[PDB]
Nucleic acid binder design. Structure first.
Ligand code: K
Ligand code: MN
Ligand code: MN
Ligand code: MN
Ligand code: MN
Ligand code: MN
Length: 136
RNA sequence: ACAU
DNA sequence: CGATGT
């Protein structure tokens, strides 16, 4: 209903799907960019959406912040809840990097706690999430 | 049918 | 038009 402006917004960006994947996190209120992941040669949109949330959790935890995280990805929000990224991406040499990062993100979830609310950004009501890359 |  | 997901 109401945007929680005191929040962190995260989003994937890509060149192809599967393709080059990156992600960033921004202050929902100001748009200030707070982190940006270096492009990963091959990944899926949903893997990046997932890594973005987990990085957000780790970022806020390190800084003792209780802000929620917004993501526009139904899939990634569920993967984080389940602590299991059920990606269909083949495991081969090409995809080894992204799969390592995803496996490690899952491992972090299974060994750490958080109270961070993970909220659905309501794109249909509010427009693009503020971490969007503007490529669509 | 919803979300990317 | 194609792909990734529940
Ligand atoms: K969107
Ligand atoms: Mn997104
Ligand atoms: Mn795994
Ligand atoms: Mn986007
Ligand atoms: Mn367009
Ligand atoms: Mn489009």
């Amino acid at each position: 209903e109401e945007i929680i402006w005191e929040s962190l917004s995260v989003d994937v960006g890509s060149q192809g799907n599967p393709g080059i994947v990156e992600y960033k996190g921004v202050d929902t209120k100001t748009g200030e960019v707070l982190f940006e992941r270096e492009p990963i040669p091959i990944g899926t949109n949903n893997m990046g959406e997932f890594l973005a949330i987990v990085h957000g959790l780790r970022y806020l935890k390190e800084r003792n912040s209780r802000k929620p995280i917004y993501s526009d990805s139904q899939t990634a929000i569920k993967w984080v809840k389940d602590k299991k990224a059920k990606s269909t991406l083949v495991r081969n040499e090409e995809t080894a990097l992204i799969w390592k990062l995803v496996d490690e993100a899952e491992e972090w979830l299974n060994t750490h706690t958080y109270e961070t609310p993970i909220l659905k950004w309501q794109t249909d009501k509010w427009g693009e999430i503020k971490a969007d890359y503007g490529r669509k």
